[PDB]
Symmetry: C2
Subunit: 154 residues, 2 copies
């Protein structure tokens, strides 16, 4: 069961693609955080979604906002994918324990062992203000993400 | 799961895993036909693993022939192994010990519980399914492939 708007966003500490520790708590009081769970690196739909994030990165990484992509892949997988795709935003590894953060947000697929396509906006207080989960074959709409982020500044 | 690395004399645990093209590969399928080299590696796209599998690729005829087969195994899913294999020119099977995470690695006693990856374990399984060679190096150490071909050569015919 996916966490809803109004819930406290579970805290986490995860390695990014360069093996550096990134914590959700660190953004508190400073930026609104977009969390983009994705199932697997090197797949077509995931490529398309993170490409859109890359293409509009200034709307997601700025003085008001940050964006974190999260999947069960380990850092080396995310590093190569990021380098080859030109992703400069953090890709975080929910790798070991496998899918623990995804489970805490209620967006883990127990059967396949991957995160579903869940998206959250966490405000400066650590409260979830936006929550979506998409069905297969559909691509998430990035205009919703920027709109939700814009609504939490002005 | 065993508490230590499986050693020579043990039955090699059977497994069925997806290779980089999502095809099922089973250890049992080689029984009575070929000696099987099992190369556990921690992570795709890392320098040491690149070097080790490059060396395997460069000497592939000594590992894939009438007497021998070689399988590389790691916790990565097939799409990860597919891209790595295509870009590295690996034509041998890379198998996904992905979900359940590290289950086969644990059955061989070569799983690193702390990091959640396979250690650099290597086995030779003979035509009867018995382990005849067993080593375990840590993710920061490099293995000697001369030992692999030596062990395979000793089991021919």
């Amino acid at each position: 069961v996916m966490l809803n708007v109004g819930a406290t966003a579970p805290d986490f500490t995860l390695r990014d693609q360069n093996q550096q520790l990134v914590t959700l708590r660190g953004y508190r009081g400073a930026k609104n955080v977009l969390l983009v769970f994705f199932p697997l690196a090197f797949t077509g739909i995931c490529q398309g979604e993170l490409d859109q994030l890359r293409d509009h990165l200034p709307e997601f990484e700025n003085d008001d906002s940050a964006a974190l992509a999260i999947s069960v892949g380990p850092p080396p997988t995310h590093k190569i994918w990021a380098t080859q795709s030109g992703f400069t935003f953090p890709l975080l590894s929910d790798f070991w324990p496998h899918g623990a953060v995804s489970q805490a947000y209620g967006v883990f697929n127990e059967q396949a062992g991957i995160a579903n396509r869940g998206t959250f906006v966490v405000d400066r207080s650590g409260i979830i203000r936006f929550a979506e989960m998409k069905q297969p074959g559909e691509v998430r709409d990035q205009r919703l993400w920027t709109d939700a982020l814009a609504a939490l500044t002005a």
